Design a protein. Structure first.
Length: 71
RNA sequence: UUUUUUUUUUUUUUUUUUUUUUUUUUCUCCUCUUUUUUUUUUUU
């Protein structure tokens, strides 16, 4: 059963990974999401998507230390 | 008015046999980063 669990998990993960495949995410209106947080880490705060349901740790600090501002 | 003679196509056939796919080289080798590892639950 635990193996089955992992199977559903990574199967749906792979199915989601192709939703974000090569088909150009630049002019088809399937690009912008929203975001809330739930936990802070020392380089990027954990993000969440209420409209799809995906998680993942992002980064504010980038490789070249070029930290973010906004216009 | 121009007679007579000068051989030709090698002889032979009534011999035994108890093996066996292939075949014979090439060295040690830096796997990058949010994690502990999540977990009940119900509709297949």
């Amino acid at each position: 059963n635990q193996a089955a669990q992992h199977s559903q998990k990574q199967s749906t993960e792979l199915f989601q990974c192709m939703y974000f495949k090569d088909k150009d995410p630049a002019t088809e209106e399937r690009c912008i999401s929203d975001g809330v947080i739930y936990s802070i880490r020392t380089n990027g705060v954990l993000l969440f998507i209420p409209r799809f349901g995906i998680k993942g740790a992002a980064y504010l600090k980038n490789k070249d230390g070029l930290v973010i501002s906004c216009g």
